[PDB]
Design a protein around this ligand. Structure first.
Ligand SMILES: *[C@@H]1O[C@H](CO[C@H]2O[C@@H](C)[C@@H](O)[C@@H](O)[C@@H]2O)[C@@H](O[C@@H]2O[C@H](CO)[C@@H](O[C@@H]3O[C@H](CO[C@H]4O[C@H](CO)[C@@H](O)[C@H](O)[C@@H]4O[C@@H]4O[C@H](CO)[C@@H](O[C@@H]5O[C@H](CO)[C@H](O)[C@H](O)[C@H]5O)[C@H](O)[C@H]4NC(C)=O)[C@@H](O)[C@H](O[C@H]4O[C@H](CO)[C@@H](O)[C@H](O)[C@@H]4O[C@@H]4O[C@H](CO)[C@@H](O[C@@H]5O[C@H](CO)[C@H](O)[C@H](O)[C@H]5O)[C@H](O)[C@H]4NC(C)=O)[C@@H]3O)[C@H](O)[C@H]2NC(C)=O)[C@H](O)[C@H]1NC(C)=O
Ligand SMILES: Nc1ccn([C@@H]2O[C@H](COP(=O)(O)O)[C@@H](O)[C@H]2O)c(=O)n1
Length: 318
């Protein structure tokens, strides 16, 4: 016969969420903090996986703030941003791993497998020490939100941040260009970016262009059967797209969750919240639908290992 097991449902909706998470999604729609007005193709468009993969290659620009982008060409900013492109400094690589921060990484023993990739991408303050067996020890790129850089005092102390390439991102007003956003960042991480950058010059540290998250959101909203959270996508999803541009093959672990699915938010923290898995602020739900939809692994890989495989843009047909 055939195996009857539940891996991530590609067509999940608000009407598949707990009431408590349903309310939170409604509230975020009202707020519209970032002044989103989706005027793209009506939500609910059906894309092939190959087709949607090209769409993401073509309509999402993965670029870092360069010295040529006004106003990072002004004197006050001179000598802060890294000289060469991130593409130059990072790879290209064959097989890469994106490690979510999910609590379901607990007792996964995924460490050795994670470390057999050329590069590993982690998020925010996700630690490696004490968790190597489940989580690995290698950190090649670390993606952080601007809130952490701005307000986490440990960002300028903990050695964990001192490994590999750093990238920071900050949500901007919807469809904003670089100068307007510089005026109105969601968190003013600019001082601390300059401050860290003074302390670790030989550590590459980039700033994601503010447009990248929204260009991705537009695609999310185009696919989704309903209106999604008017907030930018989660760090996890950005980290995936980033790696798809740096690798030929990206493995994502415990994003689409395994059989160890749990309310425990992080592998490295002891608190529960279903929202970290199912989404609150971020349209994480619809991000997961997209990953499942582009998965080139089997369902069995998801259930047992929490593992999803996407091809790098470098390798696709168009
Ligand atoms: C992402 O990102 C990206 C990028 O960004 C960036 O990138 C970089 C790299 C660069 O590029 C920069 O720039 C950018 O920014 C993006 O993309 C983009 O986008 C945009 C849009 O939006 C675009 O723009 C456009 O452009 C064009 C062109 O340009 C050029 O130049 C420039 C400088 O600046 C550059 O940049 C570019 O690239 C180009 O270049 C080119 O290249 C090419 C290649 O590709 C080349 O080729 C070559 O060459 C050589 C030598 O020659 C040889 O030949 C070989 O073979 C080849 O191959 C070339 O050379 C070069 N050059 C040229 C020029 O070509 C422009 O044009 C445009 O403009 C237009 O349109 C617009 C809209 O859009 C408008 O507004 C304007 O106005 C115009 O229009 C026009 O107008 C005029 C008047 O004014 C008219 O005229 C008329 O006409 C008639 C007849 O017809 C008559 O005659 C009369 O009399 C008159 O008047 C006309 O018509 C019109 N037209 C129409 C159509 O309408 C624009 O500006 C760009 O390009 C892009 N880039 C890229 C790269 O792609 C994106 O978008 C992003 N994404 C997102 C999503 O966001
Ligand atoms: N339970 C969890 C916890 C985190 N994550 C992913 O890991 C990423 C990193 O988590 P933080 O952004 O909270 O540091 C999230 O943006 C999300 O994509 C998840 O998918 N499930």
């Amino acid at each position: 016969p055939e195996a009857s097991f539940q891996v991530w449902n590609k067509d999940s909706s608000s009407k598949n969420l707990i009431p408590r998470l349903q309310k939170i999604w409604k509230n975020y729609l009202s707020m519209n903090k970032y002044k989103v007005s989706y005027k793209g193709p009506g939500p609910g468009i059906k894309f092939s996986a190959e087709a949607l993969r090209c769409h993401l290659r073509d309509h999402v620009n993965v670029s870092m703030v360069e010295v040529t982008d006004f106003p990072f060409n002004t004197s006050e900013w001179e000598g802060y941003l890294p000289k060469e492109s991130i593409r130059t400094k990072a790879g290209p690589w064959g097989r890469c791993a994106v490690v979510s921060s999910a609590g379901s990484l607990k007792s996964s023993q995924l460490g050795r497998e994670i470390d057999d990739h050329d590069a590993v991408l982690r998020f925010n303050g996700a630690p490696t020490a004490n968790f190597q067996q489940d989580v690995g020890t290698k950190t090649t790129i670390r993606l952080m939100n601007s809130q952490l850089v701005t307000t986490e005092k440990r960002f300028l102390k903990d050695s964990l941040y001192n490994e590999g390439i750093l990238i920071v991102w900050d949500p901007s007003v919807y469809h904003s260009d670089i100068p307007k956003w510089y005026q109105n960042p969601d968190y003013n991480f600019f001082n601390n970016y300059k401050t860290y950058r003074k302390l670790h010059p030989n550590q590459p540290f980039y700033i994601l262009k503010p447009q990248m998250p929204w260009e991705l959101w537009d695609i999310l909203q185009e696919i989704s059967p309903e209106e999604i959270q008017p907030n930018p996508p989660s760090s996890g999803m950005l980290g995936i797209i980033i790696m798809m541009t740096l690798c030929d093959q990206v493995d994502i672990y415990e994003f689409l969750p395994s059989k160890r699915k749990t309310d425990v938010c992080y592998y490295y923290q002891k608190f529960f919240d279903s929202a970290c898995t199912m989404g609150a602020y971020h349209p994480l739900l619809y991000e997961k639908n997209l990953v499942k939809h582009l998965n080139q692994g089997t369902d069995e890989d998801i259930y047992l290992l929490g593992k999803a495989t996407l091809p790098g843009f470098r390798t696709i047909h168009c």
